């Protein structure tokens, strides 16, 4: 068993709606889930998760639509990944504040 | 062959590591993700530049995929070094579509 790396990629330092992209990589076996939180609260809509692909290990990406003003206002976003009975949380926010 | 019915330019966006986005043993690495969207016809080329120089390794461009005039999307992922990122190197996703070039540039600076 290999648990995923969980990384989130964010809009540029010098500005943009846009997306947060959560990637879970280097995992096996296949079953995995991805969800999102915003300021610690469940996100109910506005994200899509792509088909899992082979990189044997696998990769999946999920994309959350976000607004620029919420990003600049230092809202904290979390990608939640579940794999093999573990839960992983990766938090991100705007660097330029 | 079946002809494409429309001509639409790509939108190009790049996604970057957050400030705590570098991992693994030193020297640490991360990634940039380029996405080109909303284009047709399907053929497209993605290239990466670092300070204007073509990057010839360390990236993977996924197959172009479908997203009413059908449009397409492509994702490319470049491995980057923390040292280069913090040295303020400028990275460019260069997208060529139907003879036109569209760039998106990023760096670590605020």
Swiss-Prot record, chain B:
It comes from the Eukaryota. Disulfide bonds join 34-93. Residues 4-110 are annotated as: CH2. Glycans are attached at residue 105. This is Mu' chain. The lineage of its organism: Eukaryota, Metazoa, Chordata, Craniata, Vertebrata.
